[PDB]
């Protein structure tokens, strides 16, 4: 009943949080690597 | 067998959550060093 459907509402919500974090994490990695690029450039300008 | 899913997605989320907190620290320390540099 409401029980059968509730689990689907979870798997949905859970796989949704995954995709969120999966993305947000990729996006932080990019912030990260880029800050490093920036440090490299600033360093070669010595 | 349904739990296996509900608990994997549940772990997978905890993993990502930790992985992302970690990468945020990496990023932020980088940003702080850039400040330390230009500063």
Q: What is the DSSP string of B6-30?
A: HHHHHHHHHHHHHHHHHHHHHHHHH
> Helix, strand, coil: what percent of chain B each, to 5?
95, 0, 5
Q: Distances from the Cα of A6 to the Cαs of A17, B5, B14, in angstroms?
A: 16, 14, 21
d(CA B36, CA B30) in angstroms, rounded, equals 10
Residue among A7, A22, A39 minimizing CB distance to B30: A39
Chain B interface includes A35 (CB < 8 A): yes
Q: How was this structure determined?
A: X-ray
Q: What domains are defined for chain B?
A: 1-39 (1.20.5.1160)
Instruction: Pick the closest to residue A21 from B16, B15, B19 (CA basis).
Output: B16
Chain B interface includes A39 (CB < 8 A): yes
State the resolution, in angstroms: 2.6
B34 contacts A35 by C-beta, under 8 angstroms: yes
**Residues in chain A within 8 Å Cβ distance of B27:** 28, 31-32, 35
């Amino acid at each position: 009943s409401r029980l059968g459907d509730l689990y689907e509402e979870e798997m949905r919500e859970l796989r949704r949080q995954v995709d969120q974090l999966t993305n947000d994490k990729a996006r932080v990695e990019v912030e990260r690597d880029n800050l490093a690029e920036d440090i490299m450039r600033l360093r070669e300008k010595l």
